[PDB]
Amino acid sequence: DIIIATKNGKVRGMQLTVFGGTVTAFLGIPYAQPPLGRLRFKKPQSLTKWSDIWNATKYANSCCQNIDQSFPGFHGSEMWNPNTDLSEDCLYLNVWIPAPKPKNATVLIWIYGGGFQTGTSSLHVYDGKFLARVERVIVVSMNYRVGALGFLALPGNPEAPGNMGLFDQQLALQWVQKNIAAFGGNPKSVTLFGESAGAASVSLHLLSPGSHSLFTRAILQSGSFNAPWAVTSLYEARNRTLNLAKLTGCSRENETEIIKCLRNKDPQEILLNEAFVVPYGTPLSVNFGPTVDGDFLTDMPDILLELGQFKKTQILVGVNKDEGTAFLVYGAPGFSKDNNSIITRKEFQEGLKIFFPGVSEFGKESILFHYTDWVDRPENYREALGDVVGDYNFICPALEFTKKFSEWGNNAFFYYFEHRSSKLPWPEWMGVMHGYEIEFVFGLPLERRDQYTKAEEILSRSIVKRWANFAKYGNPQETQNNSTSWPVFKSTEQKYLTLNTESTRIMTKLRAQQCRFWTSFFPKV
Amino acid sequence: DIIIATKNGKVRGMQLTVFGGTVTAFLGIPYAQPPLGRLRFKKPQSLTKWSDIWNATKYANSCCQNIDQSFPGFHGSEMWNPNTDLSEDCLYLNVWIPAPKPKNATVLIWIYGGGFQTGTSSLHVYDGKFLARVERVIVVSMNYRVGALGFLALPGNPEAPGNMGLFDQQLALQWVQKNIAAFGGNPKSVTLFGESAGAASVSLHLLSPGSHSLFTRAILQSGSFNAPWAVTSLYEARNRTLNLAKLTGCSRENETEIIKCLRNKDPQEILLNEAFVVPYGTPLSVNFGPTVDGDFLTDMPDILLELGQFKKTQILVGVNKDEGTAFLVYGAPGFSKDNNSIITRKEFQEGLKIFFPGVSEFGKESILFHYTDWVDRPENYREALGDVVGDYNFICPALEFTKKFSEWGNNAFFYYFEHRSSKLPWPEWMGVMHGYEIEFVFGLPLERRDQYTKAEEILSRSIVKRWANFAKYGNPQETQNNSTSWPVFKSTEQKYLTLNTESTRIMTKLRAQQCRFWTSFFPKV
Amino acid sequence: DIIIATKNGKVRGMQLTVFGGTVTAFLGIPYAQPPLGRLRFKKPQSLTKWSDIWNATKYANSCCQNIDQSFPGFHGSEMWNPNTDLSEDCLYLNVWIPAPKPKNATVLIWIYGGGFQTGTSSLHVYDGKFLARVERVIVVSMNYRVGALGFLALPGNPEAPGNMGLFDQQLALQWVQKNIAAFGGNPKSVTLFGESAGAASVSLHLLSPGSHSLFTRAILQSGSFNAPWAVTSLYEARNRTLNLAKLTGCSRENETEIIKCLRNKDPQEILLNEAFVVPYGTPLSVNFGPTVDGDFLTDMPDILLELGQFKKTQILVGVNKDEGTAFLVYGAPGFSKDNNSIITRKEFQEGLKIFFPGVSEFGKESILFHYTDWVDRPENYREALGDVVGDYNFICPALEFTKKFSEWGNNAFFYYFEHRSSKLPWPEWMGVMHGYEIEFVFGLPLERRDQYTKAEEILSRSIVKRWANFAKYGNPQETQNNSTSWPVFKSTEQKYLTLNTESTRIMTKLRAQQCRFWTSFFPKV
Ligand SMILES: *[C@@H]1O[C@H](CO[C@@H]2O[C@@H](C)[C@@H](O)[C@@H](O)[C@@H]2O)[C@@H](O)[C@H](O)[C@H]1NC(C)=O
Ligand SMILES: *[C@@H]1O[C@H](CO[C@@H]2O[C@@H](C)[C@@H](O)[C@@H](O)[C@@H]2O)[C@@H](O)[C@H](O)[C@H]1NC(C)=O
Numbered sequence A, B, C: 001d002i003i004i005a006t007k008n009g010k011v012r013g014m015q016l017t018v019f020g021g022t023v024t025a026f027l028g029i030p031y032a033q034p035p036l037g038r039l040r041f042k043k044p045q046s047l048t049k050w051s052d053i054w055n056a057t058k059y060a061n062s063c064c065q066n067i068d069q070s071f072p073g074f075h076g077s078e079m080w081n082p083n084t085d086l087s088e089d090c091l092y093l094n095v096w097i098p099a100p101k102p103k104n105a106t107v108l109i110w111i112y113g114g115g116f117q118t119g120t121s122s123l124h125v126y127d128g129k130f131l132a133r134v135e136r137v138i139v140v141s142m143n144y145r146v147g148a149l150g151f152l153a154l155p156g157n158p159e160a161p162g163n164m165g166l167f168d169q170q171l172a173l174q175w176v177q178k179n180i181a182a183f184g185g186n187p188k189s190v191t192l193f194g195e196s197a198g199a200a201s202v203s204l205h206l207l208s209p210g211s212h213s214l215f216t217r218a219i220l221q222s223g224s225f226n227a228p229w230a231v232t233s234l235y236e237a238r239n240r241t242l243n244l245a246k247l248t249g250c251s252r253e254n255e256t257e258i259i260k261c262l263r264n265k266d267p268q269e270i271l272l273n274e275a276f277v278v279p280y281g282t283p284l285s286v287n288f289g290p291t292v293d294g295d296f297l298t299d300m301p302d303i304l305l306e307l308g309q310f311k312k313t314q315i316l317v318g319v320n321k322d323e324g325t326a327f328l329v330y331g332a333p334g335f336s337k338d339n340n341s342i343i344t345r346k347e348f349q350e351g352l353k354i355f356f357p358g359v360s361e362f363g364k365e366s367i368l369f370h371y372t373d374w375v376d377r378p379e380n381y382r383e384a385l386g387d388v389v390g391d392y393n394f395i396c397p398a399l400e401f402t403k404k405f406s407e408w409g410n411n412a413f414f415y416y417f418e419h420r421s422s423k424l425p426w427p428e429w430m431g432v433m434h435g436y437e438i439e440f441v442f443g444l445p446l447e448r449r450d451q452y453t454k455a456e457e458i459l460s461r462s463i464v465k466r467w468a469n470f471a472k473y474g475n476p477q478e479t480q481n482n483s484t485s486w487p488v489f490k491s492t493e494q495k496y497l498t499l500n501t502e503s504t505r506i507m508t509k510l511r512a513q514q515c516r517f518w519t520s521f522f523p524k525v
């Protein structure tokens, strides 16, 4: 058996067989009072207490959230949908600990992405039992509130202050500071890692003075708060909150009255309306996300970043080669997972309209300009629109974050993931898609039984070791198997490392031309 | 009289006449519960307590261990055999303190070598009364468990977790932190020094976070954990533990059952079997040694070293000119202490087979290649095989440890001991053998009565002062008698200092060609 | 009235009129138990306690000590003799505090010189009322034991451990740490300053870990522990202690018996014998001085200095142009204060014999060599012998101390005092004598009534300000009156500053040729 005495009381885990060995899992440990009723929209409140043993033996409810129904039956999209019941009663977390119980293990705290609107920690690709087996770290993950239930903002108003999902994340990190030593974990050795919105959330914990002391280091996969989807401004947030009240017929004179009304609405009505709180929204729309609440976040993050006002520590940051493709089949004309999507100039022009709703005419023409001069290919426009979307949304904000961060003294490591999963269910033209490094990081290809190639095992093995070396030692080398040394990202040289199954290479200045466009010029339009 | 009140209770020492003066010795102070019975194989447990006075007036039991019987009657080998009764009841330590009682003396803590299989602190060449007389430091030494009784590993299993000898060492350092101030010693000024396995153990205390706070600085004579004999991997350890169970007919389904059985076996049966737990073993075999227990040692030490995860402090590291010769007369064909051992190519080839059991055919041919191109000498092959064995085993791992360590900021000093003791009982062709600087460090030649030359007195005097200056001031200069300044070992210049009776010289890049072979190339084969 | 409540109880001071203003003096505050009887030769014991008010209204007893009787009636020498009753009951100190009572004044603690054999703090040239009036610092001075009563050594023997005068000094600094805040003084802003043996004592407080925390910064006028008169080695000390026992017929089997006997002898018999405990002694002889006691001082100070083992802080160090002249009229042939002492080669040769008793023949010839090649002057040999004595004894050890100290990172300032007091009672050929900057430092020429020139007032004014700026701010600039900036003494450039009534100049490499002789070469002979 395996009871562990936490501050809140005792909890039971379950033994897992992994790679001829054992991991102990604690699935579904509550970390907050369920945010129901009076508590919906509020910050997570400290969890009651309890005698008797809590069975943390299965994954807990996933938070309310709209589901991706664009490809029913399709593993590509469906692997991302919640795989446990939705419920507002969702403030739970998971612990994988090596067997035997470690003495002082480094801890990795995963924060899932999904645009701040969706996601859950119980996804198969977020399963921590491998990292715990293989690198002997303890892996933790938590569910946090998404969509309006997690980010509805009416700032300076504790009824719905904004940022509740982040404070959920924070409360979980805290639970780790208070309880992980009982699990053989070292609260002084915690690395947050996360992907996409998850990566952005991690970068926001680097800015939140509330988070400073609740972790050691950070990893950002395909996301950073300076991405253009990451932060709703106070204006658009308030607009959106009201727009929502309107659609639920919860418009009121008084603002606490609006909240009180929104709290009698049922999750579904809120979920159903979340979509049209925005004018023209895109496949990247973040209807309810992080804002400048003057609590988690004290100023526009761009200012804090520019001015070195953040946790001084090492970071590991990275993006995938074809970041933007996943999004083009959610609205872009003549794109389809089911053919090769050779599109015309005219179609390219219309897709911009889709990704840059407004965004002026000249703005769009300037994107078309920067992106349509070439060594002349039917796939030209198709390739270009994916690259427009990844660069603007993922790659360039990540390279600029690394740059800005690194300028203040800390070591930074940058990777460019370029391996297309041999099992990817999406078609070929989509390439190395957004989110498809995660399974490498979590070490699924280490599982011989699971239809990955040998080369894939090897590559995941190495990534898994670099991630682990990073968390434990702030240095993501793989020192034993005669590997390519990963250099720090300097402003000036901007070296980054390439991850693939063949030649792993040191390279400089990723997307140089592209990012000058997006980073210098584009904000001005 | 001379009682000193320790935490555990009072203890009595004895006055020694030394060099027209007095040293106070405390020999055989218990520091742990005797590791007998239920406790065999476990970590050392905190020592009972006691009223009445413990007489620490003679050296205590030496730990169980196999004896070197290759030259009965021969002082060369026999000087190393235990010179007190063997017993599992062996967790004792010794204190030499200057008279009069010092006010705040720096402390040197000796850790003996002997391959982790043998050794004891009561050897005549480890006698601390000279250092205490001459440099007025307090010298401490402890016995720690060797062989399986000290290193039997079944990891994650407190019944035999591995590394018990190291935790013995650690517990002794602790006793020093808790008690040495009562002896006029400064717990804030402790230098660990040790030789061979002892040197490796010291280097492992540099990695063990458990040891960080229990000492100031370190000296490594002819040994470092990155030597190829120093660390048993988890695999080979477990293999060896089982192999042992098998030979004692202690194979069991359950693993605690295996330990329980091994604990009813008598030390001798365990001692007798320890040898053939290994396939083809060599004269350098370490059947039961340090492992990655995830307690004393959290990861492969090569990684921690490579990644700067160690105590930041000064080190003094060194090797002897003819490190490998001692081993060739324990199995190498046509070697003998009793003639000059001119050997043939064919004999050289066979000796490699002896030192590199397997180790591929090409591996051995590459050693023969690197080592058999010369200015053409009958002693060629004889000289070459000694040099193969010292370089691989002692010199190159020590130079690489210094290099790696020094890269993180700390001052490092490197010496190359090249004086052949005028009393060495081994023959001439063996040169400046492994272990034969110890008597210089401990200052035996300072003893006029003892058949050393004047030049030898002088050289020991100087070494003794440099060691002392190192421990007290982290700088191993001899500042008064117009000496050669010892420079720090930098990566890039790699200056080291030569110790002999004539010209003491500054030199660069010891065994440059040789170590590139062993350090870069050889691990790959 | 003016009572101040110290830890020991209340004390009364007296108002002084100074420069149209008021200083409050506390003269003769006890700081230790009187070291009489059982206590003679022991370390100073913590002072009883007391109700009622101690009148600290006049200078207290000066410590036992032989008097200079070479010029009865002569102000030159007699200004140095004790000007209060001698008594073993002499452990007293003085405080000058500005009126009105300061809020948080920097404190200067004067330690007098006199070869460790003589001196007292109540000398007119040590009067702190001016510094207190003019720079508003609090000035403290203490009497400490001199001669054998203060330095008799029998090391490791608390009956007479050596160094009692230093521990007297230390105990006084302590009294200042514990009590000066009650006097409006800042215990965190204490600068020790002292001259000659006093300067050496200051430099020894830089080495004594016991002193680390009892002061901020240091000033060394004409003295440093590395001067050849400053430290008696353990041998010569013990020799001297026994030699003394012999002359008092206190030779005994047992060593505590020797002390017990020496304690029934009356101060005079001890005082009378102190002189011939030495073979051939010189005018610079220090019969009983600092030793390596393994308490105040843990190792030969040369080693600690060479190895950076000292308090890291700023120092201000300096010497006078004609350091050695004062000594030549105490034994050197054909020298006299009463004529111009043109001496012959032969006389020069004999004076060396006087200053370098033995000291080999070649040693003396090498001094004559280095010092007798010139632009050919009858005063040649007379000038040369003064310069031999000052360089060896004062200048070169001070320049080398500054050099060595400064190499470890701290700012150092060096001055060369070159003004001959217009009132000096010694004759002209003696030039700028040893000890005759003190009156400048203490600011006597600020006193208009006192027969100094205007230029002298100005120069003292400036010195007094630089000293004050040094203590308060660690930087001895005089920033207001368009002065020459005092540069830090670097190893390499060795800039020092010249103090005189006309051109104050920056200069490099004082006595370059001379010190290489004394510093490199001479120790070898
Ligand atoms: C690619 O497919 C696009 C998507 O349209 C829908 O899916 C395809 C596969 C058909 O089943 C069609 O009935 C649906 O409208 C087409 O718009 C696009 O033109 C096709 N492009 C090609 C074949 O290159
Ligand atoms: C050196 O001796 C080797 C060791 O063999 C043994 O010891 C010698 C001294 C003899 O007593 C012999 O009976 C033993 O077998 C010999 O193998 C080797 O050939 C000898 N080499 C020489 C003389 O150069």
Ligand SMILES: *[C@@H]1O[C@H](CO[C@@H]2O[C@@H](C)[C@@H](O)[C@@H](O)[C@@H]2O)[C@@H](O)[C@H](O)[C@H]1NC(C)=O
Binding pocket: C333, C334, C335, C336, C338, C339, C340, C341, C342
């Ligand atoms: C300088 O005086 C030296 C000291 O000797 C004594 O003092 C002098 C002034 C006389 O009063 C004499 O009776 C004493 O012996 C003489 O040794 C030295 O030769 C004199 N040198 C001169 C005049 O240049």
Ligand SMILES: [Cl-]
Binding pocket: A482, A483, A484, A504
């Ligand atoms: Cl690689």
Ligand SMILES: [Cl-]
Binding pocket: B482, B483, B484, B504
């Ligand atoms: Cl030398």
Ligand SMILES: [Cl-]
Binding pocket: C482, C483, C484, C504
């Ligand atoms: Cl000036």
Ligand code: NA
Binding pocket: A366, A370, A517, A521
């Ligand atoms: Na542009």
Ligand code: NA
Binding pocket: B366, B370, B517, B521
């Ligand atoms: Na090679």
Ligand code: NA
Binding pocket: C366, C370, C517, C521
């Ligand atoms: Na010379």
